[PDB]
């Protein structure tokens, strides 16, 4: 029975709920009342990159720090040296409208997706020394919002069709799908060992997945809106998502629970980009209001602002040496900060 | 080493010539957004407008030497307020709604009308709205077996507008069933509009060879007030 | 985590009254507009009433005009539809629905068929 099934779910989630206080037995701000406040953080727009001719939906930092792809809804897949404001690469899209962008660890495959549920692998390395499409991937029911290459031959997608999927690029097949999110899946982060990845969905909910094994090992809830972003803190045992209630939150995989809310009153504006720093000190989360603000992860206290995009910040990412942070926005602009 | 940094200059030199071109080609181009539900036949316009798996359908058509590319959503959940933030920067959102939806889906596609009238993505973009089943609404009305006041009272105590004009041979009673409904799509408009977008109704048929020219007329309305803005002209 | 318990519904005479509760918790009540809908047998699900966040704002669909009362009481967290001279056609689950975004004009697919922020609902039978 529909009835009997709903009280046992109730009761389980009950029993979760008691174990999960009966761990919690003080607040990660009490014990971080007694470290140093890292004071105001001041960065400066140090390069501007313009060329995109309409929104930017997505960027990904190179594994060398210096290289960069940004997607922009003019059909474009631009790479940026960020050192010198020189354009390596402008790949026109056969769909305009791409709302995420990936490029490969080795720096030798980019890819991109979108509302027309299909990603698209490009060789950077031809033989030629010309840019063109080694693989499309098909299947997914809903539009692509996410994609982070595991290495050359697989990569793991987020869909609309509240799914996500890990591709062998080689066959073009779906080695793996993972289920269990009832929203669309807006964004997942790859954990450093990359064995798991996290995923928000408009479910409110995020869910921490085996990739190797294909299930879902854990689900963390305490968001009210739906989750616009994801990333792991640099050890890999922890994750922060950002939402539409206005709010950042950060969960600890072991604890199983919640750990500490990045909020301000002053905020009424859903948090569309969350990025950690090198250390995992500070993190910064892009806003409809127009700027990002960098916190104090361990505090929850805003430790500082970075203004100068004219319209909603959609990207945001740290490069692997922590050197710069890139934010783009729906103003057709990147802007590497230092 | 500062050969490699010349080539790199050249490399960026040819992207940003070839970028150039792509810009003149795409600020020539009017993007448009098509919406509607199953029972509106705004698939029978596309049809239309072309003879005269994949999660996006694209149109291309030419009126009087401007091009336009409408695009059309498919296979995606009905769940709609993520990826309509894609089309924020569109020049117009094509509502297509059967007007003769009930006996009714009529107050679901109001409501769908409400949502995007006062999205705040989509605050700045006007709405063409097409009235598309006209020809069956002026059968049922006749019919006796409408009775469009149980849905809607207030459709008792309505009087045609002064503003009104009907079609030649057409029945008074046609008229004000068909002008209430587009009342009831302009009430929600003139609510909140606030002047930065506006609302063009009309009364499309399935076959309508015109309806090229009614996207190509209002879109000249469109981007004439966004000129006139930028001077404030208007 | 975001819950939504709907209650009041029964058997109920034709012409009678009823009176539904939405008790609401894990949100923030006073931010979200709120709405009732409908998923008759046999057919699709309709949204019939919304409030917004303080009240003021309020909308029926048509068939319920003069007849159902929508209020809202951010104390309690709770919602109420006040359902006067039921009609059989009025049968249906009536499902507590909430806005995906706070203090936001819009309400995107709160009547979409697996809305994540929508209670079990509760049966009315006229």
């Known amino acids: 029975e529909l009835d009997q099934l709903r009280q046992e779910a109730e009761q389980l989630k009950n029993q979760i709920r008691d174990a999960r206080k009966a761990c919690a037995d003080a607040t990660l701000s009490q014990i971080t009342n007694n470290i140093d406040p890292v004071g105001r953080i001041q960065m400066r727009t140090r390069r501007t990159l313009r060329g995109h001719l309409a929104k930017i939906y997505a960027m990904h930092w190179g594994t060398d720090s210096r290289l960069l792809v940004s997607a922009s809804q003019d059909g474009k897949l631009i790479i940026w040296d960020s050192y010198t404001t020189n354009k390596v690469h402008a790949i026109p899209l056969r769909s305009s409208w791409v709302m995420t962008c990936a490029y490969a660890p080795s720096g030798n495959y980019v890819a991109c997706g979108g509302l027309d549920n299909i990603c698209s692998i490009y060789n950077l390395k031809t033989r030629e020394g010309n840019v063109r499409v080694s693989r499309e991937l098909a299947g997914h029911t809903g539009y692509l919002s996410c994609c982070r290459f595991l290495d050359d031959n697989q990569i793991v997608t987020s869909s609309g069709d509240t799914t996500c999927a890990l591709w062998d690029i080689e066959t073009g097949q779906q080695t793996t799908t993972f289920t269990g999110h009832t929203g669309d899946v807006m964004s997942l982060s790859l954990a450093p060992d990359t064995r798991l990845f996290v995923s928000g969905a408009c479910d409110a909910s995020a869910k921490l997945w085996d990739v190797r094994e294909g299930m879902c090992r854990q689900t963390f809830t305490g968001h009210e809106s739906d989750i616009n972003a994801i990333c792991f803190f640099p050890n890999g045992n922890a994750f922060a998502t950002g939402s539409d209630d206005a709010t950042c939150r950060l969960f600890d995989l072991r604890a199983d629970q919640e750990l500490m809310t990045y909020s301000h009153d002053n905020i009424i504006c859903g948090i569309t980009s969350v990025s950690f720093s090198k250390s995992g000190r500070l993190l910064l989360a892009g806003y409809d209001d127009f700027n990002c603000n960098v916190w104090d992860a361990l505090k929850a206290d805003r430790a500082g602002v970075l203004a100068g995009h004219d319209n909603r910040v959609s990207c945001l990412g740290v490069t692997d040496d922590g050197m710069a942070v890139a934010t783009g926005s729906w103003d057709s602009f990147l802007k590497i900060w230092n | 080493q500062r050969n490699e940094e010349k080539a790199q200059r050249e490399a960026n030199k040819k992207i940003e010539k070839q970028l150039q071109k792509d810009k003149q080609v795409y600020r020539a181009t009017h993007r448009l957004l098509l919406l509607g539900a199953g029972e509106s036949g705004k698939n029978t316009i596309v049809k239309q407008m072309r003879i005269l798996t994949s999660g996006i359908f694209e149109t291309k058509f030419q009126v009087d030497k401007v091009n336009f590319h409408m695009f059309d959503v498919g296979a995606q959940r009905d769940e709609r307020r993520k990826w309509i933030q894609c089309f924020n920067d569109v020049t117009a959102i094509i509502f297509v709604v059967a007007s003769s939806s009930y006996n009714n889906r009529l107050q679901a596609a109001l409501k769908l009308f409400d949502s995007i009238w006062n999205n705040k993505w989509l605050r700045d973009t006007s709405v063409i709205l097409f009235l598309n089943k006209q020809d069956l609404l002026a059968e049922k009305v006749l019919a006796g077996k409408s009775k469009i006041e149980d849905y809607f009272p207030e459709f008792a105590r309505y009087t045609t507008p002064e503003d009104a004009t009907p079609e030649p041979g057409e029945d008074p009673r046609v008229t004000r069933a068909k002008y209430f409904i587009r009342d009831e799509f302009l009430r929600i408009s003139t609510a909140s509009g606030d002047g930065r977008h506006y609302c063009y109704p009309h009364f499309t048929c399935a076959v309508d060879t015109e309806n090229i020219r009614r996207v190509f007329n209002d879109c000249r309305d469109i981007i004439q007030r966004m000129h006139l803005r930028q001077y404030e002209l208007l | 985590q975001v819950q939504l318990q709907e209650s009041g519904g029964g058997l109920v005479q034709p012409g009678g009254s009823l009176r539904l509760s939405c008790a609401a918790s894990?949100?923030?009540?006073?931010?979200?507009?709120m709405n009732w809908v409908r998923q008759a047998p046999g057919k699709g699900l309709e949204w019939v009433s919304d409030?917004?966040?303080?009240?003021?704002?309020?909308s029926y669909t048509g068939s319920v005009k003069g007849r159902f009362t929508i209020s809202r009481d951010n104390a309690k967290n709770t919602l109420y539809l006040q359902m006067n001279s039921l009609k059989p056609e009025d049968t249906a689950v009536y499902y507590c629905?909430?806005?995906?975004?706070?203090?936001?004009?819009?309400?995107?697919?709160?009547?979409?068929?697996?809305?994540?922020?929508r209670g079990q609902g509760t049966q009315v039978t006229v």
């Open positions: 629905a909430r806005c995906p975004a706070p203090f936001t004009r819009d309400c995107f697919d709160v009547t979409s068929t697996t809305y994540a922020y």
């Open positions: 894990g949100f923030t009540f006073s931010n979200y507009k």
């Open positions: 409030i917004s966040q303080s009240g003021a704002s309020i």
